[PDB]
Amino acid sequence: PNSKIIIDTDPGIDDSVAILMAFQMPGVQVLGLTTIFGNCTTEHATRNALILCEKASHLEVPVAEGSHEPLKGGKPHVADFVHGPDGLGNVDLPDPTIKKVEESATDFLVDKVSRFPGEVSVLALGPLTNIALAIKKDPSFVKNVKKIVVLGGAFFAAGNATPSAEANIHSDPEAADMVFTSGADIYVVGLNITTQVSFTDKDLLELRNSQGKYAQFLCDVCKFYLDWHTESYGAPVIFLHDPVSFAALVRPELFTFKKGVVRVETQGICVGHTSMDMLLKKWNSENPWTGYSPISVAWTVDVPKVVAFVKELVTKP
Amino acid sequence: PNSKIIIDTDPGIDDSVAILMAFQMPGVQVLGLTTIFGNCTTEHATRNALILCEKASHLEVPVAEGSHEPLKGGKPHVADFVHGPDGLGNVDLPDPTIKKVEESATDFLVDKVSRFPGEVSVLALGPLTNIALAIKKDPSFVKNVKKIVVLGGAFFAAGNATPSAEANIHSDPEAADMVFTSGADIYVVGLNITTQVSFTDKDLLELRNSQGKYAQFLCDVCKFYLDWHAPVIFLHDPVSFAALVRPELFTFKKGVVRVETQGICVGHTSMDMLLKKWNSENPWTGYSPISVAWTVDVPKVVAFVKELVTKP
Ligand SMILES: [Ca+2]
Ligand SMILES: [Ca+2]
């Protein structure tokens, strides 16, 4: 009954909540943590991932460091204004005693998937660079992955990096387009659904009074994330993007999915934009969406059930 | 009380309904019809506009021919599959006896707006090429226009040219970006709202039994549009006209709109919702916001279109 998963992540405040939720999930085995840039640098993401393994007493869970820059190259623009200078808010934790594995995130991904064919589900919580590099290295990777659950994109909704683009896709558009076009069993969880799942002061404070294993830390890390949300929007609500993506992987019943070809804009002002062909209309001419195999896009979300699911995992002793 | 308007159009089945509605609107004066490509070629659009003036007994309304291709150049892709080979369905009408004016659509636009400053409202029913050329020719055009009502874009909705783009914006993205960025008082009516306003067989057949001035012709022209299509039709242009004369039936949202001119998502309209303060300056920051149609009172708009078309 045990479900084998690999988490590709940039921790990251909301990533940390999802990683800890995965470690608390009963029928879930975290094969390893794959690190990437985004919320913080690849260096910081690796450190934070090692810290999480130590805190959760999951020292057996290996951490594989990935790409330091996107497919096109160049120093990435990290979201330190939303996640903190180190990517973990104001939470001052000492250096982890454990080390990263020698193999890259790409090599770890390729190896585990080929070892357990049709068994490994990949949860992509950050830019898709490592997954795209893994697809390019092994042609049987696409065939051997059970499913890829992607947190990214904005489908008929405003982006967070730019009005047109969501952060993860904006951080590496080329990689996102390569993954969405790969023909693998992909499930995309965009801002259109994650911005529906709100967390008020009530649930965050309910989490503090509980005897949750990592409750005190998660409330401490979410404190910085709350202050940014109130400054940027003027609302005392927070969207936990990564935990919603985890809920789509382990509890897909709480969501509704729509089939369609997704393409990513890699050029111009709308770089990082995710355009989905709804397939309801037959096009008069062949376009960049014709011929490619469709992927599943999260369309509807049972907001009260997802919030209660996240709360049940976080409050768990 | 009379409202001075210029219609920039590519007639066009739905454009023809809106033009005839404007001619039937009480406190509305159509200063002229500005032609453009899109639903048909610029040549066909000009012919169809002249035919409409003749049918409506509005021979005093001048027709100024505009651009035959977009700002970037090249033969445009016309929607003859949706509007017919001539852009007026299967409605076989003889050549109009009246002719177009000597001045271009750009020169007509610039002249009428400078003559009546802060009085002329421009209804853009097709690609924005003529309006962008008018902005580039006269720097005081943006200041002198009362308002520009634009039919185009797809704001958090699927496009009709591509999944990302609406036809009018896709036909000339450079022009659309130049207009949305001009700083003029712009009102955008996208697919997000036009696909909400449905016209069934019931309303179309209700229109036939009425003693409407151009009812028989409008049902004949909409017959081809119905066959192309669910047994429902979206009358895009008439909704845009309703936003110009009856804005109360709509809700508008302020925001900076940018148009993608490059790549796969060419023609996409991205609106900065302004609800979030950006940490750094981006292509949506150094520009004045425009009004985007957000909500539409669907039953009131349908009843408004019906009252104008059934009018004797
Ligand atoms: Ca993340
Ligand atoms: Ca039109």
Automatic annotation (TrEMBL), chain A:
Main location: cytoplasm
Protein encoded by which gene: LOC100282231
EC numbers for this chain: 3.2.2.3
Family, similarity comment: Belongs to the IUNH family.
Keyword annotations from UniProtKB, A to Z: Calcium, Cytoplasm, Glycosidase, Hydrolase, Metal-binding
Magnesium listed as a keyword: no
GO CC annotations on file: cytosol
One biological process term in Gene Ontology: ribonucleoside catabolic process
Cited function: Involved in pyrimidine breakdown.
Gene3D superfamilies linked: Ribonucleoside hydrolase-like
Keyword Metal-binding: yes
Reactions catalysed, as given in the entry: uridine + H2O = D-ribose + uracil
Molecular function in Gene Ontology: inosine nucleosidase activity; metal ion binding; protein heterodimerization activity; uridine nucleosidase activity
Subcellular location: Cytoplasm
Protein name: uridine nucleosidase
Sites where the protein binds Ca(2+): D10, D15, L125, D242
Record-annotated Inosine/uridine-preferring nucleoside hydrolase domain positions: 5-306
Taxonomic source organism: Zea mays
UniProt xrefs under PANTHER family: INOSINE-URIDINE PREFERRING NUCLEOSIDE HYDROLASE, URIDINE NUCLEOSIDASE 2-RELATED
